[PDB]
Design an enzyme around this catalytic site. Structure first.
Site, PDB file in Angstrom:
ATOM      1  N   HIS A 274       0.848  -1.223   0.000  1.00  0.00           N
ATOM      2  CA  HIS A 274       0.000   0.000   0.000  1.00  0.00           C
ATOM      3  C   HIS A 274       0.874   1.260   0.000  1.00  0.00           C
ATOM      4  CE1 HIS A 274      -4.095  -1.615   0.670  1.00  0.00           C
ATOM      5  NE2 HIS A 274      -3.467  -2.618   1.291  1.00  0.00           N
TER       6      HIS A 274
ATOM      7  N   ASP B 298      -5.695   5.459   3.990  1.00  0.00           N
ATOM      8  CA  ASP B 298      -5.828   4.140   3.385  1.00  0.00           C
ATOM      9  C   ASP B 298      -7.161   3.517   3.777  1.00  0.00           C
ATOM     10  OD1 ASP B 298      -5.103   1.979   1.814  1.00  0.00           O
ATOM     11  OD2 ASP B 298      -3.073   1.882   2.645  1.00  0.00           O
TER      12      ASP B 298
ATOM     13  N   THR C  58      -6.603   1.269  -3.429  1.00  0.00           N
ATOM     14  CA  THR C  58      -5.526   0.719  -4.246  1.00  0.00           C
ATOM     15  C   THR C  58      -5.908  -0.599  -4.906  1.00  0.00           C
ATOM     16  OG1 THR C  58      -4.461  -0.514  -2.453  1.00  0.00           O
ATOM     17  CG2 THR C  58      -3.947   1.831  -2.650  1.00  0.00           C
TER      18      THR C  58
ATOM     19  N   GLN D 215      10.696  -6.014 -12.709  1.00  0.00           N
ATOM     20  CA  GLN D 215       9.384  -6.309 -13.279  1.00  0.00           C
ATOM     21  C   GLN D 215       8.932  -5.211 -14.234  1.00  0.00           C
ATOM     22  OE1 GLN D 215       6.016  -6.582 -10.525  1.00  0.00           O
ATOM     23  NE2 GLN D 215       5.374  -8.486 -11.527  1.00  0.00           N
TER      24      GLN D 215
ATOM     25  N   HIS E 211      -0.116 -13.654 -10.851  1.00  0.00           N
ATOM     26  CA  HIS E 211      -1.015 -14.084  -9.788  1.00  0.00           C
ATOM     27  C   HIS E 211      -2.276 -13.235  -9.713  1.00  0.00           C
ATOM     28  CE1 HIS E 211       0.847 -10.624  -7.956  1.00  0.00           C
ATOM     29  NE2 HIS E 211       0.068 -10.724  -6.895  1.00  0.00           N
TER      30      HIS E 211
ATOM     31  N   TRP F  38      -3.370  -6.653  -8.034  1.00  0.00           N
ATOM     32  CA  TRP F  38      -3.851  -5.451  -8.710  1.00  0.00           C
ATOM     33  C   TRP F  38      -2.700  -4.604  -9.237  1.00  0.00           C
ATOM     34  CZ3 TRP F  38      -7.290  -4.363 -11.692  1.00  0.00           C
ATOM     35  CH2 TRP F  38      -7.686  -3.055 -11.992  1.00  0.00           C
TER      36      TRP F  38
ATOM     37  N   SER G  24       0.212  -5.665 -10.042  1.00  0.00           N
ATOM     38  CA  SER G  24       0.813  -6.411 -11.143  1.00  0.00           C
ATOM     39  C   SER G  24       0.045  -6.195 -12.442  1.00  0.00           C
ATOM     40  CB  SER G  24       0.876  -7.898 -10.795  1.00  0.00           C
ATOM     41  OG  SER G  24       1.640  -8.111  -9.620  1.00  0.00           O
TER      42      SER G  24
ATOM     43  N   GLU H 245       0.567  -2.676 -13.763  1.00  0.00           N
ATOM     44  CA  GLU H 245       1.845  -2.551 -14.456  1.00  0.00           C
ATOM     45  C   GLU H 245       1.819  -3.267 -15.801  1.00  0.00           C
ATOM     46  OE1 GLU H 245       5.180  -3.718 -12.078  1.00  0.00           O
ATOM     47  OE2 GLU H 245       5.401  -1.705 -11.230  1.00  0.00           O
TER      48      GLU H 245
ATOM     49  N   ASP I 255      -8.768 -11.066  -3.817  1.00  0.00           N
ATOM     50  CA  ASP I 255      -9.349 -10.352  -4.946  1.00  0.00           C
ATOM     51  C   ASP I 255      -8.743 -10.744  -6.286  1.00  0.00           C
ATOM     52  OD1 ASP I 255      -6.938  -9.214  -4.041  1.00  0.00           O
ATOM     53  OD2 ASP I 255      -7.363  -7.350  -5.116  1.00  0.00           O
ATOM     54  N   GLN I 256      -7.759 -11.637  -6.300  1.00  0.00           N
ATOM     55  CA  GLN I 256      -7.052 -11.987  -7.525  1.00  0.00           C
ATOM     56  C   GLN I 256      -7.940 -12.700  -8.549  1.00  0.00           C
ATOM     57  OE1 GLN I 256      -3.626 -14.183  -6.151  1.00  0.00           O
ATOM     58  NE2 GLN I 256      -3.154 -12.635  -4.595  1.00  0.00           N
TER      59      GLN I 256
HETATM   60  C1  LIG Z   1     -20.108 -10.091   1.383  1.00  0.00           C
HETATM   61  C2  LIG Z   1     -20.430 -11.392   0.670  1.00  0.00           C
HETATM   62  C3  LIG Z   1     -21.455 -12.266   1.404  1.00  0.00           C
HETATM   63  C4  LIG Z   1     -19.855 -11.689  -0.476  1.00  0.00           C
HETATM   64  C5  LIG Z   1     -18.821 -10.889  -1.273  1.00  0.00           C
HETATM   65  C6  LIG Z   1     -17.291 -11.036  -1.026  1.00  0.00           C
HETATM   66  C7  LIG Z   1     -16.485 -12.139  -1.860  1.00  0.00           C
HETATM   67  C8  LIG Z   1     -17.210 -12.531  -3.138  1.00  0.00           C
HETATM   68  O1  LIG Z   1     -16.068 -13.258  -1.080  1.00  0.00           O
HETATM   69  C9  LIG Z   1     -16.838 -13.959  -0.181  1.00  0.00           C
HETATM   70  O2  LIG Z   1     -16.575 -13.542   1.079  1.00  0.00           O
HETATM   71  C10 LIG Z   1     -17.430 -13.915   2.089  1.00  0.00           C
HETATM   72  C11 LIG Z   1     -17.081 -13.181   3.392  1.00  0.00           C
HETATM   73  O3  LIG Z   1     -17.972 -13.386   4.384  1.00  0.00           O
HETATM   74  C12 LIG Z   1     -17.446 -15.455   2.253  1.00  0.00           C
HETATM   75  O4  LIG Z   1     -18.677 -15.980   2.139  1.00  0.00           O
HETATM   76  C13 LIG Z   1     -16.466 -16.073   1.201  1.00  0.00           C
HETATM   77  O5  LIG Z   1     -15.162 -15.964   1.511  1.00  0.00           O
HETATM   78  C14 LIG Z   1     -16.736 -15.508  -0.245  1.00  0.00           C
HETATM   79  O6  LIG Z   1     -17.801 -16.030  -0.884  1.00  0.00           O
HETATM   80  C15 LIG Z   1     -15.138 -11.486  -2.407  1.00  0.00           C
HETATM   81  C16 LIG Z   1     -15.468 -10.557  -3.637  1.00  0.00           C
HETATM   82  C17 LIG Z   1     -14.964  -9.151  -3.259  1.00  0.00           C
HETATM   83  C18 LIG Z   1     -13.822  -9.400  -2.220  1.00  0.00           C
HETATM   84  C19 LIG Z   1     -12.702 -10.029  -3.012  1.00  0.00           C
HETATM   85  C20 LIG Z   1     -14.506 -10.503  -1.304  1.00  0.00           C
HETATM   86  C21 LIG Z   1     -13.487 -11.022  -0.149  1.00  0.00           C
HETATM   87  O7  LIG Z   1     -14.201 -11.829   0.785  1.00  0.00           O
HETATM   88  C22 LIG Z   1     -12.912  -9.810   0.713  1.00  0.00           C
HETATM   89  C23 LIG Z   1     -12.165  -8.866  -0.255  1.00  0.00           C
HETATM   90  C24 LIG Z   1     -11.048  -7.884   0.451  1.00  0.00           C
HETATM   91  C25 LIG Z   1     -11.675  -7.014   1.570  1.00  0.00           C
HETATM   92  C26 LIG Z   1      -9.965  -8.740   1.156  1.00  0.00           C
HETATM   93  C27 LIG Z   1      -8.693  -7.986   1.624  1.00  0.00           C
HETATM   94  C28 LIG Z   1      -7.922  -7.333   0.469  1.00  0.00           C
HETATM   95  O8  LIG Z   1      -6.695  -6.741   0.919  1.00  0.00           O
HETATM   96  C29 LIG Z   1      -5.452  -7.238   0.537  1.00  0.00           C
HETATM   97  O9  LIG Z   1      -5.038  -8.353   1.302  1.00  0.00           O
HETATM   98  C30 LIG Z   1      -4.397  -8.252   2.569  1.00  0.00           C
HETATM   99  C31 LIG Z   1      -5.365  -8.136   3.816  1.00  0.00           C
HETATM  100  O10 LIG Z   1      -5.823  -6.851   3.960  1.00  0.00           O
HETATM  101  C32 LIG Z   1      -3.393  -7.065   2.633  1.00  0.00           C
HETATM  102  O11 LIG Z   1      -2.261  -7.418   3.281  1.00  0.00           O
HETATM  103  C33 LIG Z   1      -3.064  -6.615   1.196  1.00  0.00           C
HETATM  104  O12 LIG Z   1      -2.136  -5.616   1.238  1.00  0.00           O
HETATM  105  C34 LIG Z   1      -4.343  -6.135   0.482  1.00  0.00           C
HETATM  106  O13 LIG Z   1      -4.031  -5.827  -0.802  1.00  0.00           O
HETATM  107  C35 LIG Z   1      -8.895  -6.357  -0.361  1.00  0.00           C
HETATM  108  C36 LIG Z   1      -8.197  -6.102  -1.692  1.00  0.00           C
HETATM  109  C37 LIG Z   1      -9.006  -5.006   0.349  1.00  0.00           C
HETATM  110  C38 LIG Z   1     -10.358  -7.057  -0.718  1.00  0.00           C
HETATM  111  C39 LIG Z   1     -11.457  -6.212  -1.461  1.00  0.00           C
HETATM  112  C40 LIG Z   1     -12.465  -7.150  -2.216  1.00  0.00           C
HETATM  113  C41 LIG Z   1     -13.225  -8.194  -1.330  1.00  0.00           C
HETATM  114  C42 LIG Z   1     -14.437  -7.520  -0.674  1.00  0.00           C
END
Ligand SMILES: CC(C)=CCC[C@](C)(O[C@@H]1O[C@H](CO)[C@@H](O)[C@H](O)[C@H]1O)[C@H]1CC[C@]2(C)[C@@H]1[C@H](O)C[C@@H]1[C@@]3(C)CC[C@H](O[C@@H]4O[C@H](CO)[C@@H](O)[C@H](O)[C@H]4O)C(C)(C)[C@@H]3CC[C@]12C
Length: 390
Positions: free
Chosen positions: A13, A85, A107, A268, A283, A286, A288, A291, A307-308
């Site tokens: 970050h 942040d 980010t 990279q 992987h 974001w 990556s 860039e 989120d990948q």
């Molecule tokens: C609410 C519900 C019902 C369903 C929807 C959620 C989902 C489908 O997923 C569902 O989630 C449910 C949760 O209850 C479950 O049922 C099940 O897991 C699944 O179906 C997916 C889709 C959207 C999702 C991808 C979500 C994940 O969960 C949580 C993430 C998270 C918040 C994780 C931490 C990430 O941050 C990094 O990672 C490290 C930790 O901060 C750091 O170190 C690093 O620097 C950072 O870059 C960042 C980038 C901020 C993302 C943003 C996107 C988000 C919202």
């Protein structure tokens, strides 16, 4: 005029915040201030911005306790605005306690955030772009509950606008969705790309757009069996490749010079910017992808957690890459990797992809600078509005 930045205590970050500092300080004579502990400050001691120190109090860390320290820091600076942040939690609170507008910087991709923000703002659920996420599925974790709360809060605390490290050419649809969901004006600032010799010496001696870069590790997870799978995939692809690993695992003395392996840190940005590169097995982080798409390099999506997968399927939706087909037990296979590597990097069917990644790349280098210009002038708007409010 004067802006303050509080990036979270994560190297994933700090770089976007520092590049945003460089971008805002060079225009509109923005008196810049960046606040973070000395350990995370002294890593980016390079090239207009002013830095700040922060001492924590001794007896996921103690960052939730540096509240009064940041309060005294704000009372000292009294900046016109604070760009925080997502996990500080108290940064918008302390900014409000000093009557300072707090702007949230995201980010991450806009679609990954749109999934959650729409699951929150609309327990009427539904999704306007369901080629991404659909219904008819079942899922349940307090780990993720806290994360989602920290996610919505920093989305609501932002004042009028929400800065995002993304651009319209990739997901303006999802950007406008996020705008209409959060009732805030999503202002994109584009990507934030920063910037021993054997790598360059080897890459120059190759043909143009015939080398595939691999960095699926990226300081996360990488098992020896997965090492073997991706290595056999690279081998049966019969293509030039540069693979960076985190740390039996193959026989590099055998398929040497047709490829090249690095133990740790690789150029990279410099590798992707080289004219002889035309592939990136990523992987789906974001930064990556931000860039990769800046230099017109297609994306072999090998996603896994967080989120990948959403970033990878967004890249597949916009047609600038392709994902591997996991085997029966949900694991990428040698053939599942080689198929997509050949179909993207060298095949004429993937030329479409190969072309879009270029047609998009120029666009990013065409509309550049002005994104951050409009972002800066929108920040000046919020400060002036606050002053007029009295
Ligand atoms: C609410 C519900 C019902 C369903 C929807 C959620 C989902 C489908 O997923 C569902 O989630 C449910 C949760 O209850 C479950 O049922 C099940 O897991 C699944 O179906 C997916 C889709 C959207 C999702 C991808 C979500 C994940 O969960 C949580 C993430 C998270 C918040 C994780 C931490 C990430 O941050 C990094 O990672 C490290 C930790 O901060 C750091 O170190 C690093 O620097 C950072 O870059 C960042 C980038 C901020 C993302 C943003 C996107 C988000 C919202």
């Amino acid at each position: 005029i004067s802006i303050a930045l509080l990036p979270f205590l994560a190297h994933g970050h700090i770089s976007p915040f520092f590049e945003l500092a460089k971008q805002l300080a060079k225009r509109n004579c923005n008196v810049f201030l960046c606040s973070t502990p000395i350990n995370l400050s002294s890593i980016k001691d390079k090239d207009a911005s002013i830095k700040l120190v922060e001492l924590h109090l001794p007896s996921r860390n103690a960052f939730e306790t540096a509240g009064p320290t940041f309060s005294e820091i704000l009372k000292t600076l009294n900046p016109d605005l604070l760009i925080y942040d997502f996990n500080p939690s108290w940064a918008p609170e302390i900014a409000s306690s000093h009557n300072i507008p707090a702007v949230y910087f995201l980010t991450t991709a806009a679609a990954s955030s749109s999934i959650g923000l729409h699951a929150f703002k609309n327990p009427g659920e539904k999704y306007p772009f369901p080629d991404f996420y659909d219904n008819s599925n079942i899922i349940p974790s307090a780990d993720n509950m806290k994360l989602l709360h920290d996610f919505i809060a920093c989305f609501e605390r932002s004042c009028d606008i929400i800065l995002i490290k993304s651009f319209r050419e990739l997901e303006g649809k999802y950007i406008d969705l996020l705008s209409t969901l959060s009732d805030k004006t999503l202002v994109p600032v584009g990507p934030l790309v920063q910037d021993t010799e054997q790598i360059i010496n080897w890459l120059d001696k190759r043909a143009e757009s015939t080398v595939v870069f691999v960095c699926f590790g990226s300081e996360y997870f990488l098992s020896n069996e997965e090492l073997e799978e991706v290595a056999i995939g690279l081998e049966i692809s019969t293509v030039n490749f540069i693979w960076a690993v985190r740390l039996p695992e193959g026989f590099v003395q055998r398929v040497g010079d047709r490829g090249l392996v690095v133990e740790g840190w690789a150029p990279q940005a410099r590798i992707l910017g080289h004219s002889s590169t035309g592939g990136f097995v990523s992987h789906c982080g974001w930064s990556s992808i931000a860039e990769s798409m800046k230099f017109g390099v297609p994306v072999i999506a090998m996603a896994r957690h967080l989120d990948q997968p959403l970033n990878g399927k967004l890249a597949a939706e916009v047609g600038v890459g392709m994902e591997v087909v996991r085997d029966e037990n949900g694991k990428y296979k040698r053939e599942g990797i080689a198929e997509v590597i050949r179909k993207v990097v060298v095949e004429k069917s993937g030329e479409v992809i190969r072309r879009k990644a270029r047609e998009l790349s120029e666009k990013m280098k065409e509309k550049g600078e002005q994104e951050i210009d409009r972002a800066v002038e929108e920040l000046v708007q919020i400060c002036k509005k606050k002053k007029d409010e009295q």
